[PDB]
Design a protein around this ligand. Structure first.
Ligand code: NAD
Ligand code: NAD
Ligand code: ZN
Ligand code: ZN
Ligand code: ZN
Ligand code: ZN
Lengths: 374, 374
């Protein structure tokens, strides 16, 4: 019925900044050369979707269909597409892997010259769109737009996964889980037997703890202001639990005492510059490594020159440093092989129509992840 | 004729901050357990000597004998010493290598648990001193105090060198040349065929240029506000020369445009937090590595989180990442084997009595290195 034809379906639309989303009937165009049309089965809600909704003065960033944590099935492919075919399970990616540039061929990064981030980062979505609604063009957030029953993505931003994978759970691999896990594994490169510290225990932080654990860290200290987050952190692998509010001296001093000078690796999963500094200063001199995972821009992050001169290394990453087309398929298999957890992240589930309820919980830090059905 | 006796000799003493030095007759006590008494034959003047005297000026760090880039002959050793004997050529060090702690045992660092830094870091001198003058105790800068005919340094902070080494030149290895060269080769790990940028062209920056050349870099851009240094930069292997004042755009933009994005490796060798930020940002996304070498503890260094999240790495270096007793002897052998340059760093030579003149030259960037006779 659908193949070779324009589709009419439902989608959560953000017509403008600071306004609740409205579920609309949109038209999805057929896939053009080097593109794939996907029927989305599930999608997580991430803090980056809210950042755009609440913090975008960029009028040209709207109207837009948000979402970048989904999983689905190939409905059709555009001209010149041999890589994919109808029926295969896939996961759209917010970063590209053209596989031909200087960055794609280097094992040191997951960067690329293609994608909206290089073409148009200001509006946070590609210039070209395959969505229309009430005669108006509606943008595709990060080139993924998973808050729609049907989406169209360029093949260099699509990962083919195991045909047995559960779409209503693996969808988190599109962003959140891969970010925390990879930051520990790929970026920090946590080693067996080491001591680690993770700041912030949301989905990114919890995934970071799981990453430290998979790498074989001997000690993993989970740090968070909210003591209600400790039980899940234990389930993911953390060995120690520290609440900064419980100590009058800076958190770096506390961790320093507990570890005899600081940890081997630390990861910031809050997105606060004051936490970013303490995270670095909590590391041991000589070989301590700290990774900025959480992000903000409103403010500069800073430290005293001696911190780095004494031997510490400061790094950062996007999407956990994973080269998408290679990393996501491996993570799907790891979950299926029982080496990686995912179910434990999903605290709420609700229909696409309840998207505003999901945004509110997230806004008030009332959940880890909320997965929506489409 | 001096063994077992207190020595009276000449030393340039700084009674207080911001004041010119005074050639005084001081008493040098006999070496205590595990210590070496050394007759200094030559010592260079480094900007770090000026930092304490003019910038930091820590109030409890005076009176003091500065100097930490010398070379000499062993005069006598304290009990427990078997590695050194009178008449052997040595180079004192501003950092320790006890060889038994966790840091000394790791190939990842040149840190140690001993030294003035681990007890009196802000003072810039150990708590104990072997110098006396006018019945007043006088501190030994960095535990080396080379602006004296005779000094006393603990053995873990002294490197023994080749018997045929020219003391009037190898003294540069005491700090400046090992620092710069090392920061490139050891800390940044410059790769063959890569592109680099060195900010600041004094002896440390010029040594950094040399290191980039030794590592086989394809392009080395020298950056300095004072264009008079470009000639020596070329001597040491630089391929490009940029004076920030000749461009309206911020320096980071000039470099990016010159390289189509940014350089692979960069190094700051000035001691200015603003320059430190610029060096980091002149690096390419994905795999760019920037290293701090300049010294200051009066201000914080900063940047935007995105700089690191895009794929950049920020590090710092202390004495070029060389393990004192291991690295220095090898650098001497390299100079003797015609693999590294040293003489080209020495632009001025003058007696100890002219110390204030050498300092003044440095103060006005009117020299690379001035080396004193005693
Ligand atoms: N690098 C990437 O690819 C990428 C992608 C998406 C999101 N992010 C970042 O991930 C960050 C967090 O994501 P999340 O979904 O887990 O968020 P979340 O809001 O679910 O969790 C954040 C946690 O941090 C804790 N916290 C806050 N201040 C703290 C402090 N001062 N000290 C200790 N703990 C503190 C909170 O109590 C909370 O438990 C965001 O800020 C975002 O910028 C990064
Ligand atoms: N990390 C260590 O172990 C270590 C060792 C030795 C020296 N240091 C520090 O190294 C720094 C330099 O030492 P030095 O003796 O070579 O100094 P120097 O004063 O001889 O050279 C500094 C050079 O930087 C240049 N410069 C100043 N501002 C600049 C700018 N804005 N842009 C580009 N160039 C600029 C100056 O013109 C000068 O040529 C100092 O801060 C010193 O304290 C650290
Ligand atoms: Zn690419
Ligand atoms: Zn996200
Ligand atoms: Zn020095
Ligand atoms: Zn040691």
């Amino acid at each position: 019925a659908t193949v070779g034809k324009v589709i009419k379906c439902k989608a959560a639309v953000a017509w403008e900044a600071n306004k609740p989303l409205v579920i609309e009937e949109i038209e999805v165009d057929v896939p053009h050369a080097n593109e794939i049309r996907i029927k989305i089965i599930a999608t997580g809600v991430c803090h980056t979707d809210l950042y755009h909704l609440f913090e975008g003065k960029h009028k040209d960033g709207f109207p837009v269909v948000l979402g970048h944590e989904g999983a689905g099935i190939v409905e059709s492919v555009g001209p010149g597409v041999t890589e994919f075919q109808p029926g295969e399970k896939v996961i759209p990616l917010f970063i590209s892997q053209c596989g031909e540039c200087r960055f794609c061929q280097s094992p040191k990064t997951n960067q690329c010259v293609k994608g909206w981030a290089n073409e148009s980062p200001d509006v946070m979505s590609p210039k070209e769109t395959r969505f229309t609604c009430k005669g108006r063009k509606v943008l595709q957030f990060l080139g993924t737009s998973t808050f729609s029953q049907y989406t169209v993505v360029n093949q260099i931003a699509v990962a083919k996964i195991d045909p047995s994978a559960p779409l209503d759970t693996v969808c988190l691999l599109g962003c959140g889980v891969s970010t925390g896990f990879g930051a520990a594994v790929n970026t920090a490169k946590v080693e067996p037997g080491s001591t680690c510290a993770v700041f912030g225990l949301g989905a990114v932080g919890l995934a970071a703890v799981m990453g430290c654990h998979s790498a074989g860290a001997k000690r993993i200290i989970a740090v968070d202001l909210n003591p209600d987050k400790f039980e899940k952190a234990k389930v993911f692998g953390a060995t120690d639990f520290v609440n900064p509010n419980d100590h009058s001296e800076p958190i770096s001093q506390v961790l320093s005492k507990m570890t005899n000078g600081g940890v081997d690796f630390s990861l910031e999963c809050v997105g606060n510059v004051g936490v970013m500094r303490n995270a670095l200063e909590s590391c041991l001199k000589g070989w301590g490594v700290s990774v900025l995972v959480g992000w903000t821009d409103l403010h500069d992050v800073a430290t005293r020159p001696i911190q780095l001169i004494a031997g510490r290394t400061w790094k950062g990453s996007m999407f956990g440093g994973f080269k998408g087309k290679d990393g996501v398929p491996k993570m799907v298999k790891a979950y299926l092989d029982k080496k990686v957890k995912l179910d434990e992240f999903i605290t709420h589930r609700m229909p696409l129509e309840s998207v505003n309820d999901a945004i509110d919980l997230m806004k008030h830090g009332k959940c880890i992840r909320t997965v929506l059905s489409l």
